[PDB]
Structure 1
């Protein structure tokens, strides 16, 4: 959960960096792709931890700081979907997101 929170802070900072620019460049798209791949793997790991279900792991995550990371992802997802939908060339990145 802590690593996921570090990742979501980093992704939010990167999105704030690229918010002003109208079109994301190739290197920015590549960095986004790597970050989202890592985040996807971390989410898969958390889902594997909690499914079954494991009540202890469920309670641990509930008391943990997962909620803040999910909030950061919600904000980033909304804004990034809008920005990337405005542009057609970034369709692959939008699919990944």
Structure 2
């Protein structure tokens, strides 16, 4: 079910991670001017509620472990967009808006 879907989702993030690693100015600017931010917000929203639900069931722990490493693949992609970051950078500022919009889900993630 979600096990095969999350496996594909990791590779989508890993490919996105690979494009910007070894800082490429063009690719970072292209991804900044893209619908990736809303795609992250939806994934963050899914990450928030599903972690709470999956933690209750002891037989569904294996799904949570696969879910957890998927979130690790996302944050690496976000940490790669900050390569070559400058003060008040466009890519940095656009990420701040994305965190603000999904601030409700992040609080549960930290919790």
Aligned partners of 2:18 and 2:39: how far apart in 1? 18
1:48 counterpart (9, 12, 18): 18
Aligned partners of 1:50 and 1:41: how far apart in 2? 15
2:35 is matched with 65
Structure 2: runs of 5 or more not aligned: 68-111
Q: Secondary structure at the match of 1:89?
A: coil
CA RMSD of aligned residues (A): 0.5
Shift of 1:95: 0.3
Q: Secondary structure at the match of 1:64?
A: coil
Question: Structure 1 stretches (4+) deviating beyond 4 angstroms?
Answer: none
Count how many residue pairs are aligned between Structure 1 and Structure 2. 67
